[PDB]
Amino acid sequence: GEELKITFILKDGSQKTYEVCEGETILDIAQGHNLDMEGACGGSCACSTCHVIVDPDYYDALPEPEDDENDMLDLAYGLTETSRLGCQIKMSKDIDGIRVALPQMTRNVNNNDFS
């Protein structure tokens, strides 16, 4: 088929560069691949860890969320000019070489496990 990819900047600063399909979501790849990362949305009724930021190349085409939706971003440290929403934007033909950064996360309160 046409093929696509996603780069994530790790909470460890590393780059990881993953082959995915169209219509896949960014927190959904991050925890679906179990990147070396912090977050909890992959658990059963656990979805409140929406926090990513984009490359200014692949943002420049992207929409802005509601005040309850963009709050799920703010929960991670150091929110930026190109912050993006982990269950509200996905891979399409225009993404072919996209990046995001995976920010450090304040509090998720799972004690032992989310999955």
Q: Can you say which residues are annotated as belonging to the binding site for [2Fe-2S] cluster?
A: 41, 47, 50, 87
CB of 107 to ligand FES, least distance (A): 14
- Number of H helices and E strands in the chain, helices first, is 2, 5
Cβ-based nearer residue to ligand FES, 37 or 50: 50
Pairing of strands 98-101, 4-9: parallel
CB of 40 to ligand FES, least distance (A): 8
Sequence-ordered list of residues with C-beta below 8 angstroms from that of 34, at least 6 positions apart, any chain: none
Q: Phi and psi (nearest 5°) for 10?
A: -70, 160
CB of 2 to ligand FES, least distance (A): 25
Cβ-based nearer residue to ligand FES, 2 or 34: 34
